[PDB]
Amino acid sequence: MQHNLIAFLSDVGSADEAHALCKGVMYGVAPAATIVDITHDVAPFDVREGALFLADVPHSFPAHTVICAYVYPETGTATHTIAVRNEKGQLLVGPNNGLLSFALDASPAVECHEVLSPDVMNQPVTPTWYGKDIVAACAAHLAAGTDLAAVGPRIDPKQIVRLPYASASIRGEVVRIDRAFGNVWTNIPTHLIGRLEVKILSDTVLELPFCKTFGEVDEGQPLLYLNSRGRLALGLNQSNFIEKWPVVPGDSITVSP
Amino acid sequence: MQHNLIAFLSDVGSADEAHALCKGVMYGVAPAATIVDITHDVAPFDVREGALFLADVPHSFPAHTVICAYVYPETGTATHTIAVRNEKGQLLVGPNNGLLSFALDASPAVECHEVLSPDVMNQPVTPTWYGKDIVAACAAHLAAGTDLAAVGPRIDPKQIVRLPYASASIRGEVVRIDRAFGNVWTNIPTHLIGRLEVKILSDTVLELPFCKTFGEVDEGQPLLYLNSRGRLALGLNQSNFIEKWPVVPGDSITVSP
Amino acid sequence: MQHNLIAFLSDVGSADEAHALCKGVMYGVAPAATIVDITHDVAPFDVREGALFLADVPHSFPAHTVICAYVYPETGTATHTIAVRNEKGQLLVGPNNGLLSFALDASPAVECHEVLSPDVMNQPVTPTWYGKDIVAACAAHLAAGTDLAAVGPRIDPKQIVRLPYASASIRGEVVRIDRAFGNVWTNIPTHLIGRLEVKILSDTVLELPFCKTFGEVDEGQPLLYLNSRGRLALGLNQSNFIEKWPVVPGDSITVSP
Numbered sequence: 196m197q198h199n200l201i202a203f204l205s206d207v208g209s210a211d212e213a214h215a216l217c218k219g220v221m222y223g224v225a226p227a228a229t230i231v232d233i234t235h236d237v238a239p240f241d242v243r244e245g246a247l248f249l250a251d252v253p254h255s256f257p258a259h260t261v262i263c264a265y266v267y268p269e270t271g272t273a274t275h276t277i278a279v280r281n282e283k284g285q286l287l288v289g290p291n292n293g294l295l296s297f298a299l300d301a302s303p304a305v306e307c308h309e310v311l312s313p314d315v316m317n318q319p320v321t322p323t324w325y326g327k328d329i330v331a332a333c334a335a336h337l338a339a340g341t342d343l344a345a346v347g348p349r350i351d352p353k354q355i356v357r358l359p360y361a362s363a364s365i366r367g368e369v370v371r372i373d374r375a376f377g378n379v380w381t382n383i384p385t386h387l388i389g390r391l392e393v394k395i396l397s398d399t400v401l402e403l404p405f406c407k408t409f410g411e412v413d414e415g416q417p418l419l420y421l422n423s424r425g426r427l428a429l430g431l432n433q434s435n436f437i438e439k440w441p442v443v444p445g446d447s448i449t450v451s452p
Numbered sequence: 453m454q455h456n457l458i459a460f461l462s463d464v465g466s467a468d469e470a471h472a473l474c475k476g477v478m479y480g481v482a483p484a485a486t487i488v489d490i491t492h493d494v495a496p497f498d499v500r501e502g503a504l505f506l507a508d509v510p511h512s513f514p515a516h517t518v519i520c521a522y523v524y525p526e527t528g529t530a531t532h533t534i535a536v537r538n539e540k541g542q543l544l545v546g547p548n549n550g551l552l553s554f555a556l557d558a559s560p561a562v563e564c565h566e567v568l569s570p571d572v573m574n575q576p577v578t579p580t581w582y583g584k585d586i587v588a589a590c591a592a593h594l595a596a597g598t599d600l601a602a603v604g605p606r607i608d609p610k611q612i613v614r615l616p617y618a619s620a621s622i623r624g625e626v627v628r629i630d631r632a633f634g635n636v637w638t639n640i641p642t643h644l645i646g647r648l649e650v651k652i653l654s655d656t657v658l659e660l661p662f663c664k665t666f667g668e669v670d671e672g673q674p675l676l677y678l679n680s681r682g683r684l685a686l687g688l689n690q691s692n693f694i695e696k697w698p699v700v701p702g703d704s705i706t707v708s709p
Numbered sequence: 710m711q712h713n714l715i716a717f718l719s720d721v722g723s724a725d726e727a728h729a730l731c732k733g734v735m736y737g738v739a740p741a742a743t744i745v746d747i748t749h750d751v752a753p754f755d756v757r758e759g760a761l762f763l764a765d766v767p768h769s770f771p772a773h774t775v776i777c778a779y780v781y782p783e784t785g786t787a788t789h790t791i792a793v794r795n796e797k798g799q800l801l802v803g804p805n806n807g808l809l810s811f812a813l814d815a816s817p818a819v820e821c822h823e824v825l826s827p828d829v830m831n832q833p834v835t836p837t838w839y840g841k842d843i844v845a846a847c848a849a850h851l852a853a854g855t856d857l858a859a860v861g862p863r864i865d866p867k868q869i870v871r872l873p874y875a876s877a878s879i880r881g882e883v884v885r886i887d888r889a890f891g892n893v894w895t896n897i898p899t900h901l902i903g904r905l906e907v908k909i910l911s912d913t914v915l916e917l918p919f920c921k922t923f924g925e926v927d928e929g930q931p932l933l934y935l936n937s938r939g940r941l942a943l944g945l946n947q948s949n950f951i952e953k954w955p956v957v958p959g960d961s962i963t964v965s966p
């Protein structure tokens with residue numbers, strides 16, 4: 196089934212031609228397709244960061260999307276590329292190394308195949324650039340309407356490598372930092388908490404108001420809020436939270452009355 | 453009226469998925485549309501910088517463009533999003549916080565509405581991301597051909613918040629720095645000045661040649677020139693001016709014989 | 710001949726609107742065209758870096774591509790813009806300052822013209838922005854199907870300025886660094902070498918395994934490999950090579966048994 200929108204993520208950066216050569220390959224295979232970057236600024240080899248960036252992609256993108264993603268330090272080894280159709284009807288192509296984990300949490304795999312057929316690859320395949328020659332190439336063939344079954348053998352969904360994700364029990368942790376603004380996102384869902392005391396940084400205790408948005412406190416002041424989808428977040432109104440309280444992903448966050 | 457080209461600016465950066473999720477929403481609503489970034493590297497919350505970046509957009513882009521822009525620290529408050537048709541026939545969508553000021557100077561507002569209708573929003577609207585759920589969503593509905601009147605109530609052009617812009621009287625000031633090259637742009641127009649003495653930095657006095665272009669002086673040497681549209685500028689031939697004379701926006705520049 | 714794909718490179722960065730204004734001009738002229746960035750992060754004025762980034766573009770992109778590239782410190786002087794049809798049938802537009810050198814090595818010029826006709830320029834042409842008003846504008850006219858002969862007078866291929874490129878004789882040198890990962894690329898071709906001793910950094914001698922890919926050594930360990938097209942490269946498995954051995958382009962690399 197034609198999937199005319201390719202959404203593209205990698206760790207190769209956008210500061211040289213690498214990411215663009217992949218687009219060249221994709222436009223060659225699927226001249227009817229639109230290519231849009233998710234980002235190419237995933238930290239090098241950081242599969243978990245890439246996985247986090249993909250989490251909300253299935254929901255925000257239409258059904259005719261191919262999610263093409265690679266953070267692939269295992270390029271040229273036995274770790275295969277996989278192609279997946281999800282419950283929304285979107286297609287996903289990436290290394291079977293955990294990268295697609297959180298995107299699949301959002302919309303589960305319905306059918307999954309290993310990408311082994313030379314006919315969906317850019318030949319000759321260079322061992323160090325499976326990202327271009329297998330992931331990007333296959334994504335474009337699928338965008339063009341190639342049968343998922345033609346990419347290679349079917350595998351069971353459990354054969355898709357998944358990254359563990361910690362759940363809040365209220366004790367949670369920092370999942371990621373929105374580096375543009377310095378806002379801190381936790382794994383604490385809306386329902387578990389429904390001024391509060393927040394414990395982090397030599398047992399830092401902050402008394403923070405729970406707000407709907409940034410502007411409900413004065414400029415530079417800290418706030419708690421529920422972020423763009425259902426998770427507790429910390430920020431400063433028009434300032435950078437991690438410049439005041441330098442927390443990293445994995446650090447514990449406890450919220451109590 | 454269909455406006456098949458969406459030009460997109462924000463302060464969310466291009467180093468994670470945020471800006472891409474907005475594009476996902478827009479492609480979902482307007483599958484016939486082309487989306488092109490202006491930039492997402494506006495300094496966080498810096499409405500004036502965003503406004504400056506938009507100034508030359510109306511002239512450079514065709515009439516069938518929707519200018520979709522958000523630098524929106526007031527997200528989730530009483531400061532509304534507005535939708536505008538300009539004199540060129542382009543559409544603009546952004547927060548009513550001054551962001552569109554200089555784009556509107558270039559091509560004035562003809563009709564303006566507040567974006568209040570849920571039917572042009574991405575539901576449910578998250579208080580902290582009006583950028584995606586109102587600005588981007590509405591821009592896409594307009595691109596798809598939604599009547600401007602359908603977005604919400606008409607307002608008078610004077611209800612559009614405008615950022616003050618200093619005029620040269622020759623005494624002017626630094627407006628912006630082209631950070632890629634370090635060239636300094638002033639507010640001094642072509643007609644007011646038509647070697648010269650330039651006073652800035654402990655009363656720095658420079659004797660500079662007025663040139664048409666960079667290569668009219670030797671490499672590394674300073675020059676005065678009229679920039680890409682009618683304003684006096686300072687640069688070094690194949691070097692970075694603000695690395696030699698570290699001026700910031702707002703600093704006074706006086707030019708005399 | 711219509712060339713519906715414009716691949717776009719410059720040194721103006723993607724952190725402000727400059728690169729986007731060029732796209733505005735191009736979309737205005739060629740509304741049927743798709744514009745994809747190669748990169749805008751070429752170091753300022755660095756023609757050689759830009760040239761290197763373009764080298765693999767002809768091969769990776771389809772025949773209906775216009776390669777639009779400018780790193781143009783000679784803007785507004787006697788150094789003209791040129792338009793070229795290559796052996797693949799692609800079109801290229803850029804300053805005649807060496808920028809297109811390595812792209813032309815990959816697919817030689819068949820026909821070349823100087824861009825002198827006002828009718829393929831964005832009028833009025835600003836002396837400091839030939840990149841937008843001549844290079845981008847002309848690229849779009851060619852994309853739209855303008856006869857190459859209409860841009861200006863024919864020149865001989867030898868009138869295209871070329872950058873010298875050092876050949877390996879095994880003694881070679883560092884050509885470029887993949888800054889995303891810190892991998893080092895040399896000019897040493899596959900055939901000249903077909904554990905090895907590598908001499909660089911106070912006569913640094915390393916004993917390195919020759920591998921097909923990164924994962925064939927333990928994490929953090931150095932390796933030799935043949936890169937994404939036929940040249941000897943140095944890297945660390947999931948680490949940054951130039952953070953351990955800080956080599957720059959031009960530095961000698963000797964490989965021996």
Ligand SMILES: Nc1ncnc2c1ncn2[C@@H]1O[C@H](CO)[C@@H](O)[C@H]1O
Nearest residue numbers: 266267268270324325326890923947
């Ligand atoms: N030095 C390296 N070590 C391990 N993987 C690398 C290295 N350089 C690039 N890669 C990987 O190559 C992949 C592309 O095939 C990238 O996604 C990247 O993770």
Ligand SMILES: Nc1ncnc2c1ncn2[C@@H]1O[C@H](CO)[C@@H](O)[C@H]1O
Nearest residue numbers: 376409433523524525527581582583
């Ligand atoms: N910590 C913050 N304080 C104020 N505004 C913010 C913050 N983080 C993000 N935003 C704003 O949210 C907007 C998107 O709705 C962005 O344009 C940005 O300016």
Ligand SMILES: Nc1ncnc2c1ncn2[C@@H]1O[C@H](CO)[C@@H](O)[C@H]1O
Nearest residue numbers: 633666690780781782784838839840
């Ligand atoms: N200060 C400068 N000196 C020389 N060239 C410049 C300068 N600033 C911008 N340019 C050149 O202008 C070109 C666009 O016409 C860019 O490719 C850039 O190389």
